[PDB]
Amino acid sequence: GAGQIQVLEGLEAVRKRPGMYIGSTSERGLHHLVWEIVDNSIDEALAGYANQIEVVIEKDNWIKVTDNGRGIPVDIQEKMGRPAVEVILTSSVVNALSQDLEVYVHRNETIYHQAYKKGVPQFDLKEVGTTDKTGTVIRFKADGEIFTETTVYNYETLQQRIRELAFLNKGIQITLRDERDEENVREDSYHYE
């Protein structure tokens, strides 16, 4: 009960003063969404559990982030009575500030899925398939109501920072791919020693 009320209030808080959370609602804050997700994958590699991160700019400026870590856990929490992944994603700034967000978890030889709008789950987490891999996929579309200047990402901005992050975090393979124009797909992949 109380825990879920505090999630809703957290969502209202983020969406009311987004600049207080991501710095700005300009092009800078739009790209900050990517960094918030990529940092969580980087943590999972530094913990010893992932070594590959993929960032795709999809049609209509969805972003897809994929890592080969353990998979965000799906076990039910004592505190929230909800799957752990739902708790982690409902308190995410990126989810609060996205019109839509999807997660796919590969864990327990199972694929789990949940979708959200403005941070609100659209349906309970569900098993959708099977897998012999572990990791996590997050796809989101920035909310144009928040990001009033632009919701268009800059490949070069993303490329520069991805290359910095792979240089800093040696051993992680970080790939950027732009699929916005299906006729000309660009990829850069970074992997330092």
Ligand SMILES: CCCc1c(O)ccc2c(-c3cnc(-c4cnc(C(=O)O)c(O)c4)s3)[nH]nc12
């Ligand atoms: C593309 C997604 C980016 C991305 C996020 O935004 C957010 C969380 C993410 C994580 C994980 C978080 N917690 C994890 C874990 C897994 N297993 C155990 C265990 O004990 O087995 C455990 O304690 C913890 S994985 N990975 N990636 C994430």
Ligand SMILES: [Cl-]
């Ligand atoms: Cl689990």
Ligand SMILES: [Mg+2]
């Ligand atoms: Mg963070």
Ligand SMILES: [Mg+2]
């Ligand atoms: Mg962390």
Ligand SMILES: [Mg+2]
């Ligand atoms: Mg983080």
Ligand SMILES: [Mg+2]
């Ligand atoms: Mg490596």
